[PDB]
Amino acid sequence: MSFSGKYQLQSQENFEAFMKAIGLPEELIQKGKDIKGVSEIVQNGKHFKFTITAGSKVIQNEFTVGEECELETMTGEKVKTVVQLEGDNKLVTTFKNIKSVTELNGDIITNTMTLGDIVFKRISKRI
Template structure:
């Protein structure tokens, strides 16, 4: 895991997320300060994602219901819920 100070730093950071969906393909761009992360994936297929730490990790993103993107990255479960123009992590 990450040290507690890095976890808190991550919680305090403000970010802007943009998600573009084309069928089962997604492009997610997250801008946090001056850092821009862009990951592309297809639901149910293995992909490599760049993390905020700069590390790369292989994962499979699945869709739960009609609006939840779920991935396991390095032992952490990431759930992103899409509700219209609102994204909840």
């Protein structure tokens, strides 16, 4: 299943709480909370390049599924982990007490990051 494309953020939930619990500066949280930008996925076989607009920052990350990767987090911190496919439409990984699920259903990509009882959910639509 092709994940490739550009996706417009439509709605999200718990941006503020989630950014607070990972330690993002309050200034950046205020500036970033209502920015609904475009994120992009470039897939090539098992390799993925993610360019993610989140608040006032754009972060680039890549990985090959199944292989270990180094990911840059929102605070800038770097973490070792691995990303796996769960089925044909779901990308799942974990780091820094966070479980992340990225599911693509047609033109809608749902991203759910759970940290404690905070569920940071982002819904985006293919453009």
